[PDB]
């Protein structure tokens, strides 16, 4: 079996992308943020504290003939941007793009932090990292991808995120019309539960490629591209009006500027992020200052290849027993 679903950014900045996903029987369609840097599938539901629900579509497990309460089980999760939620757990049928899994754990939020309440377009998360990071207790639950592997034509999914445009997640096959040239595969380390790999280096604009190991994670659920301080400072050194801004939290530059491209190595191959991708948007509507898409990972702890990086490529998440990460230009 396979599935194919369209993913759309939630706003004009590509801050995040949502993908529809059918839960329950009959189907209830919620728009979830597909998150390769977490391993929980949780949704707003009829159980979420009323005052904490602002425009989102909720999952009512009492309307679903196939839902089963997973008794005893609760979950609690916090994320890098400080948001958090917790609740209890049902199992139910979940379909993505025509690909159906039965007895998927669907984590029902009893409470949600303020940034999730403030986000009317995101009805919950679908996590696609390794199931070791799942927060359900006392027994951890499998991700939608892990549940689907038995039935997939090939154990893979692909992420093809658009630049200010829709994209696609595919499960179970690789669309050879979606990319150019060939995919290069690089090893994944699952030691920390992430889709963690090591880039072979970087170039800025049309200067030299510098061979240097950059260990980081591929995370569809992070907006920007976070790299070590001295690489990020090499990049913005090529943009004449760029400076680090403590008020806004990162490098800003005149929106006027044509930004250089940024290249990252995957083994012997090169992926090039266009300049315009790195222009993330003005810091305010009408401002002349724009916020950069490449920022220092020094206060995160880990380098993150986020949506800024991933939307310039076709990315294959190869979940065979020894996983790998594939990138092609598109």
């Amino acid at each position: 079996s396979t599935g194919s679903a369209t993913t759309t950014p939630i706003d004009s900045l590509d801050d995040a992308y949502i993908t529809p996903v059918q839960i329950g029987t009959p189907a209830q369609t919620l728009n979830l943020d597909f998150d390769t840097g977490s391993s929980d599938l949780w949704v707003f539901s009829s159980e979420t504290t009323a005052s904490e629900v602002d425009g989102q579509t909720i999952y009512t497990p009492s309307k679903s003939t196939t839902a089963k309460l997973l008794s005893g089980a609760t979950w609690s999760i916090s994320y890098g941007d400080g948001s958090s939620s917790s609740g209890d757990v049902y199992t139910d049928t979940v379909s993505v793009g025509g690909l159906t899994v039965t007895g998927q754990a669907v984590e029902s939020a009893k409470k949600v932090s303020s940034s999730f309440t403030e986000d009317s377009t995101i009805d919950g998360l679908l996590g696609l990292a390794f199931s070791t990071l799942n927060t359900v207790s006392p027994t951890q639950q499998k991700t939608f991808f892990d549940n689907a592997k038995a039935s997939l034509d090939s154990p893979v999914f692909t992420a093809d995120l658009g630049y200010h445009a829709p994209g696609t997640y595919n499960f179970g096959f690789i669309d050879t019309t979606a990319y150019t040239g060939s995919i290069t595969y690089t090893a994944v380390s699952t030691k920390q539960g992430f889709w963690e790999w090591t880039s072979t280096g970087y170039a800025v604009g049309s200067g030299t490629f510098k061979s240097t190991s950059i260990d980081g994670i591929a995370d569809t659920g992070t907006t920007l591209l976070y790299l070590p301080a001295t690489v990020v400072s090499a990049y913005w050194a090529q943009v004449s009006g760029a400076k680090s801004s403590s008020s806004v939290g990162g490098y800003v530059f005149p929106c006027s500027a044509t930004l250089p491209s940024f290249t990252f190595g995957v083994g012997s191959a090169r992926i090039v992020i266009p300049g315009d991708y790195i222009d993330f948007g003005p810091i305010s509507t009408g401002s002349s200052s724009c916020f950069g898409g490449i920022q220092s990972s020094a206060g995160i702890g880990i380098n993150i290849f986020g949506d800024v990086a991933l939307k310039a490529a076709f990315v294959v998440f190869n979940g065979a027993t020894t996983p790998t990460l594939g990138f092609a230009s598109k």
Binding site: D33, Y79, G80, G221
Partner: peptide
């Protein structure tokens, strides 16, 4: 404006 950063474990 509003960038996202999805899990913490240890």
């Amino acid at each position: 404006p509003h960038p996202f950063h999805x899990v913490i474990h240890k």
